[PDB]
Amino acid sequence: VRAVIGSTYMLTQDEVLWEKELPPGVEELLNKGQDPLADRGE
Amino acid sequence: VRAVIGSTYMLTQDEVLWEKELPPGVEELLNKGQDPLADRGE
Amino acid sequence: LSLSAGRPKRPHARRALCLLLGPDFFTDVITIETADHARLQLQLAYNWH
């Protein structure tokens, strides 16, 4: 499984989308912590 | 019984999936302890 | 990073992916005792970077 970043990628014949399962708690810190320099009081 | 890690492995003619039975308590520490550097207060 | 936050500085709060290196400051109340057995709570700004 690789991370393709760049142009608009099209899946080849033998590729399927891989679901990255983040550890619990981390998913809250990415949605909540959009900018921790300004969002810091809570 | 061996641990195959790497490419997408396909079972041969004389291989069956082996269920690793962890000791009790350890299975809780792998599901709960995803990141003990951040998840440490409990 | 399971950091510390709040006034009395609870040890497990403000969990967070980032770590600021800028000149910030955390205010903590600390209740200390003097040499005359007159305990008093006081605050420090703690300018850190």
Ligand SMILES: Nc1ncnc2c1ncn2[C@@H]1O[C@H](COP(=O)(O)OP(=O)(O)OC[C@H]2O[C@@H](O)[C@H](O)[C@@H]2O)[C@@H](O)[C@H]1O
């Ligand atoms: N996600 C984070 N990553 C790294 N460092 C952090 C994070 N969140 C807070 N910190 C640091 O830990 C300190 C904890 O502060 P708190 O006790 O939550 O707030 P308080 O001490 O009352 O006041 C701090 C004050 O300083 C300013 O940086 C901030 O605007 C706040 O008003 C913060 O000031 C900040 O510098």
